């Protein structure tokens, strides 16, 4: 008669096999840092910024899944994988 309209482990696999904020910064940094810095400085510094940012977010995302499930793992092991 009538129709109404009303309102973990795979997550780790998604992260490890490769955040909107991460993708906009990498795109943003790519199109500007080379336009600012010269030879072996635009690519060198741009790669350091992207990689450092990626490592921080990758470890946080992985540890966010395990810590919500009560699983305690030292950051050493995750940092080895992310490296």
């Amino acid at each position: 008669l009538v129709t109404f309209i009303y309102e973990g482990l795979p997550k780790v696999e998604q992260v490890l096999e490769v955040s909107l904020n991460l993708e906009k910064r990498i795109k943003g940094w790519n199109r500007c840092i080379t336009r600012i810095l010269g030879i072996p400085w635009g690519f060198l510094i741009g790669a350091e910024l992207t990689i450092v940012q990626s490592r921080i977010s990758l470890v946080n995302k992985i540890q966010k899944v395990y810590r919500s499930q009560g699983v305690q793992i030292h950051n050493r092991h995750i940092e080895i994988i992310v490296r």
Binding site: N21, K24, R25, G28, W29, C32, I33, I36, I45, E48, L49, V52, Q53
Partner: peptide
């Protein structure tokens, strides 16, 4: 998060010793 702005990000790289 590192700042999206380039020169702000350069400053954070020096503050965090990146």
């Amino acid at each position: 998060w590192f700042p999206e702005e380039p020169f702000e990000a350069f400053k954070e790289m020096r503050e965090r010793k990146v």
